[PDB]
Structure 1
Amino acid sequence: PSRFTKTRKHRGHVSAGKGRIGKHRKHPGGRGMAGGQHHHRINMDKYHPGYFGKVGMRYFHKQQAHFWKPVLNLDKLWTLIPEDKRDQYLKSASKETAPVIDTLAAGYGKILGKGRIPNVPVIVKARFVSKLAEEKIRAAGGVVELIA
């Protein structure tokens, strides 16, 4: 609010905390990103290296969502099972009746493997997997079932 503001404090001081020598004028650097390559270049390299020029291929009419593919790590995985339902499967860990997890149905695209899931067998359904994501699953005796 206006009353906590420092301009209230400055009232009675000529220069408004702007200095007498070098004033407060309109635009001295220029407006905007002016002089990027010239009188403000020192700032732009450091603070902003890479800013100028060009790299890589142009993509006309890229539609995002073409490339939709959210990642879920093994890291969680078990998260996708409701906590009550959950414990029931961890204990009693066998083939014959192992949980199915439609990770697409969660809303994930690929399963990466950030590591360590208990030795419980699980049937994991996904569109995509890391080479290790699988191995790890398989070491618990789960499998990966590819869907779309």
Structure 2
Amino acid sequence: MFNKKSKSRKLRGHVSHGYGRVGKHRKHPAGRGKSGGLKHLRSLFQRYHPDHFRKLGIVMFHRNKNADFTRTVNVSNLWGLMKLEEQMKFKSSAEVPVVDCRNYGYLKVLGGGDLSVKKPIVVIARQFTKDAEEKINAVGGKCVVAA
């Protein structure tokens, strides 16, 4: 629902506000923040967060996100990049489509699934998996590497 009354409004008239008579509601009974984790809170850490207390891995003091950013597509989705009206033309037509993945912000092609239509296609990208290359060549298509 888009709106509902709160619990606090029902607790008017009941002594302890739902915190108990014996236990009460004190200020900080367990400590502040995420502290105590090697000591009295060891059971919470070993159950939910086992890889917290450690150092790991190779270090580079400065990294650049733009130099490493990439996005991946599978062969089964190649025909899907075209508009539905465009798909329905190339399905019947005698011509071969020329699809450039760079134009949709994809740089690497993966070998997942089968091609939607079993007719030739030209695919342009920066990198192909070994499975992807074999699948495209199977239908008489061509893989073109480009920057």
Distance 2:112 2:67 in 1: 25
Distance 1:69 1:122 in 2: 23
Q: Secondary structure at the match of 2:124?
A: strand
Distance 2:135 2:47 in 1: 43
Is the 8 Å Cα contact of residues 68 and 109 (structure 1) preserved in structure 2? no
Which of 93, 100, 103 is the equivalent residue of 2:101? Answer: 103
Q: Which amino acid aligns with 2:36?
A: G
Map of 1:47 onto structure 2: 48
Map of 2:87 onto structure 1: 86
Map of 2:139 onto structure 1: 140
Q: Which amino acid aligns with 1:63?
A: N
* Segments of 4+ moved more than 6 angstroms: none
TM-score in terms of structure 2 length: 0.91
Instruction: Tell me how far 1:90 sits from its aligned partner.
Output: 2.5
Instruction: Tell me how far 1:3 sits from its aligned partner.
Output: 7.2
Distance 1:2 1:119 in 2: 54
TM-score in terms of structure 1 length: 0.91
Instruction: Tell me how far 1:123 sits from its aligned partner.
Output: 0.2
Answer yes or no: is 1:12 the counterpart of 2:10.
no
Alpha-carbon RMSD across the aligned residues, in angstroms, is: 1.8
Map of 1:114 onto structure 2: 112
Identity %: 43
Q: Secondary structure at the match of 1:99?
A: strand
Is the 8 Å Cα contact of residues 112 and 132 (structure 1) preserved in structure 2? yes
